[model samples]
Target chain A: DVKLVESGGGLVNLGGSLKLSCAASGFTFSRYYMSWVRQTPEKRLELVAAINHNSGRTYYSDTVKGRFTISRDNAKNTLYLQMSSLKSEDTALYYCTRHPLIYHGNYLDYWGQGTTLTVSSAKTTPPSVYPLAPGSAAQTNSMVTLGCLVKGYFPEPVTVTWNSGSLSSGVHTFPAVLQSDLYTLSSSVTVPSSTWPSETVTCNVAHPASSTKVDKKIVPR
Target chain B: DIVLTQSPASLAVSLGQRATISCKASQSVDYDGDSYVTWYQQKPGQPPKLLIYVASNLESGIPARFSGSGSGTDFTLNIHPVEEEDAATYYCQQSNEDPWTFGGGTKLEIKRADAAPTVSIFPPSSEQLTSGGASVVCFLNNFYPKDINVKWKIDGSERQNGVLNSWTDQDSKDSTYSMSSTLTLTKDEYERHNSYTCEATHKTSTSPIVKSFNRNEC
Candidate 1:
């Protein structure tokens, strides 16, 4: 039978580099292909490309295209997926994929148990934004549109809403086409306000597969 | 890349009973009009072995009790009269090119047979002679395991063979293995009392176990 075994554990420091290996047993290494995937902390699973142990050819998913590489040592019957520029977000469980037959497509039928990578001494950073020029404060009967973008999730749908005083209203949500490997979601809401002071408008991206909320909020002008 | 997901992960079967293994590919493997998938069986302490290659062609030396059939991404491997040696893990592999994958192995168990079925064939009751030409045909039905190979021999030597084919009800889930083979000859050749014989052979071993059909009174 075809079997895939992965390395026991991994240890890495913040801003450091790390590599993990998934070894195959009881089969011809050259005759079959291997792949790597990651299940991040938030339960998001992404397909990493597979590598040909015989020819040294590798195919990678768009998000990880240049950030990672896959290689194998035939003598040891092992395949490796190496990641660089270690970040806290990169800490997740990784798996090795193997293709039993000789074919040239990314079909990961078999998977490994998963190797966990913990990033130590990592700091959480806020999303970066550029500030616009400051203007004189004024009250006007104007409409402000807030756009929320979300992507790379499944099953549970995401929503956006506005909350002010005792009123809450739902915003229009639209599915955006994937510009990269990850899925994209965007939602827009037009708020009619006599005065644009400080009002909280939240864009919440939710999915049944996840328990925590992936949300972003902005105070529109 | 076609991903295959096999369910039940494992199984237990009685000896001489039938065992079935199923596999579903992640996507359709049919390419350029042909599905390029195959199934294999691996016994304990042995290398991953091939039972049915290219979906239906029995690998040379495979047991007559083992057979496979399916199209596109779905496939099944069936074993009949599960022998002690038949107890092993079976896997389905794809050959659709790059990123090929396999289903997890399924373990098969074999126990003693509870009951056995018998098969019977009908002999040609009439022969037509025209232009001094005559022909005879024999038909067999309900062959237990489909792995049997049918061959025609004249006297002691093998003769030119004719079309051999097998058909099954597409809608039925019956796991029975079935097949048929035919041979044709002329009147002068038939009168030689050439001792025409039909033989069936078991497929598992390097050499086939041959059983001859009797046409003594003919």
Candidate 2:
């Protein structure tokens, strides 16, 4: 009753993430959804995650909740799946089928062909941050805007938070963009110039594989 | 939810003998107007195929010899005079849980002295010719064991989409089986001499058996 197209098959490292999408047509997307599952030789199908398009909830087993990201973009008739920290056992044919008819498990109404993901034990380099457009250090007692961009990151669990001495400020972090193998995340903040170079505006980035938060301090430079 | 608990961890049955597999649910699987029990069967390698769903209802094109009965928590999947291909693990799963659960599988082993499936590709018809739409069917003749992979491709690239369905040959000899699937192309794909292929994969194959047919051949 429906068609699902899944693309993107490649080899990824241990610290890397696999991003793929399934575009659905020939049916009402909001009415039915595309949930992701992997097909294996053992005839055992693993439920990677079910990104509910009806209620907009991305559901998965708690064991993989943090590793699997199924993003539902309701505006477009598609769901983007980004799976990170892939293990060698993750290699298989990843399939997406329409809804199993509400909370019911793994009944494939219509099965979509899949991509073979190859995961290697190779490690990926960590990300580095620098101010993209640092606010003005020239102006004293005036408002200033600054940005902290973290580049060369493998996964997406990496997020940015801002810290200023004792004060923790809310910084607007934009969506991470993928460049070939890695991702780049940008966080920006606007504060009074009164804090000047004295107040250290820190971007504390978090990652699943990182031992400590990736911290990058910025003011003017 | 009615939970299905099955008996007989393993059984060896002769071909054409009555093999009864039973399932017991903790409560009534019958709820919300639909019997919550579903029967799934799988061999050693291939994915689990749905044999019966919602209890007592056989999936489309499934053999008639396979039947299911009983309701509430007690149910049974019966292979009357079991076929050689019937030997496999049968698992009973139930709906009604917000999620779902499955009973430990009941393994059935049937002794089979087997044969290799021979396949043929059938051509398009005159009606399909005039409409500029054509299709072909690949036939896998009676062979022992039904676990086979049939794939369709256009040119050399593997075509993974479209409606490809396979069923075991029920009318064949006692211990042998046959399977077939159709490869279809539409009016949009109408053309002459376009190469189409069907590759058969099975345990019998040292390598995949490939069969090719041109669109004009039909």
Candidate 3:
């Protein structure tokens, strides 16, 4: 069994540098060469670079030869990828991969939960907020739930609240997922079935990256 | 290729407890009528064997204890009341896209009420040392459940780079297992008179089984 983890990836301004960490465990970290694979929006997947912890050797694809640097800290069982001079085309899901044994083919046998990288040229961009369409609400045993979809935001830390945080008891905000170079997330508020139709619920979104706050109100039919 | 992510790298479960492993594809793996997800089990010292196919179908000759389920981008493999013999690493592979990819393996380790491994370190022979390179071996025998971790340390600091570890091999005669780790050194390092220690960790042992080696002791 082997596990690789890459976390904390988000928006990086164009021309900015991003360094990612891939923590290896459940196996000897230095036994095999670890690789970084990129999957772009165009559905193209390629091995970008690799590092041999034991030999301190590295290999890079011609596509990313000069822009990517691979390194490892054997003591920490961690591998690193430093990407400099980023471009929008560099935005993709980067996976940490390795072969099961030292005698395997070029294809990787194990993969990590990829880290999503979004390179944005803009320093800030407000999210496009919208209420769930009609019939999107779900009624669970007398409790009605309403939701809002927030998309296309940059510099990812955003907060979604219901009625200015007044409705906090049953509020749940899902973690943002990056797609098409933007971040998208959803939030839902649940109240008694009888409370919603008579009273409209509003979803307020706060985007500190853009210094903007917007709210979308939903009315019952 | 579609990216597949597996979870819980390794599970430490009691002998009769159910163990579960999950694999999530970046995109839907379903095409036409079948979901292209397949599961494999790799026991120590052996190649991977297919267990489940097309998402939920059990491969022929596989035991009833193993099962799989899911479609689209999410899938799972399950082992009920996992037996000691079932201890191994499991992986999920998808063929729906070109250059099929595999999930990071999920190792299932059984918790047995037995003894820990007996450790022994074999110092390199003089002949080996004279060859300008030598291999020091640490052998661990009689460990149960096949889950063990071995570390090589030289002079109190871990030897992380350029060390070799082996998969656990069972000795059918006594129904126990044996595992080994090797630390290769240059003649310069071998003659440095540094203390080499092999630490073996097992579920049954409260602490790692330690064995030390020195050229003078050989």
Candidate 4:
């Protein structure tokens, strides 16, 4: 008889991360391919792909390109699915299926118990550091550039803006871009500084969908 | 993606009448020099039971009359003079590739007998009984151009059915369709001479035939 065992747990908050496992017993794990599937809340089942533990070949489902990853530990005969930047939409049960080496068809003959992860208490925050003068203690005008970084984003695609008190905003001299698998936004703007101390500026990061914004202010040194 | 179609989705026939099932494959199954065709019978909730494999080789102990024949894309499973026990849905499957497909099934029906005839009894002889358990032989004397089904029933209920054993040639043109079903009743059960019947039913030719026997007198 074929059997599947799943992890048991509760809901996870947005920005929090979690990993779950599906383990097989009473069978030869290396003799067959193990596959993963996801069933979204009120959605059809999506085929993730199959992992050949014997040769270490993995195929991914088209829709799961950037959101999910599957790995296995042959020594333990266990499969893992990791999700980053948890979102409410990611709340669903995940299953593992077994494909026989010599099967009659492409159909999955066996399936695993499922693990569920729920996203709750979602909140959006903005850039941690902001404000720009030609040269503030936080910003370097002569030989240094100002940097703004935001972290712990759930449901990605954030926007960053630099603002000054005057109607005219300082010209952006240099910009930097960095990203992680989930949702973390970072940007840097540099401007020419005539004096050691420059005008005060603010950096604001906002998430439009959540209607939440965070800001930081600093003066050029 | 070859599809299969079966006719007479359902049929009712009396014992001793011919039963024919036809299957048409969308494409020729002559792959790799072998016909990728087969037929199966599923009784109720049980898994499919293979009747014919690789177009024709009768799987190990299957009866001789349950023959299959055809070439390339067309095939047929013919059971001569169908028996009452041969009433189930028959399906044909293709073993050509990954997706082994199955055809919609055809359910076989058993026509009611016209009259309740007397059954002859054939109990195991002294030597046969000494070997333990009585051997009851059911024979169909005049079944030409017809297939026959032989089975053992105890007290009107079927016991563990026997597979088709072997047949003999009593003459050049006339052959004997013989099958033996064993009933290992307790000595008391056997001595009680309770009625046990071995029945043969056939239906290939114009006239249907059915013969029954009781175990008390044999």
Which is the leading candidate under TM-score? 2
Tell me the spans in candidate 1 whose CA falls farther than 4 Å from its real position: A1-49, A53-56, A60-68, A73-79, A83-221, B1-12, B24-27, B32-34, B40-53, B57-65, B85-89, B93-218
DockQ of 1: 0.01
Each model: TM-score of chain B? Answer: 0.49, 0.54, 0.67, 0.50
For residues B1-218, what per-residue lDDT tens digits would candidate 2 score against the true structure? 33456798666567788787888888777775677677777664334566777778777667988888787778899887887677578877775553355676787767465567665444444444565645555656556565788878777777765434444423222444555565556756646347777788888877888766665442
**How well is each residue in A1-221 modelled by candidate 1, as lDDT tens digits?**
66777773454666677778888887777777677766554443455667775755777766666877888888888888777767767777777866646433223445666777766552222221111111122113365434443434432233434342222332334433322223334444445553234655555545433443555555332
Clashing pairs in 2: B3-B25, B143-B177
Worst 10 residues of 1 chain A by lDDT: A126-135
Q: What TM-score does chain A of each model score against the native chain A? A: 0.49, 0.49, 0.66, 0.49
Clashes of 2: 2
For all candidates in order, the CA lDDT equals 0.53, 0.63, 0.71, 0.53
> Number of backbone collisions per candidate, in order?
16, 2, 0, 21
Report interface Cα RMSD per prediction. 33.4, 24.9, 27.6, 40.8
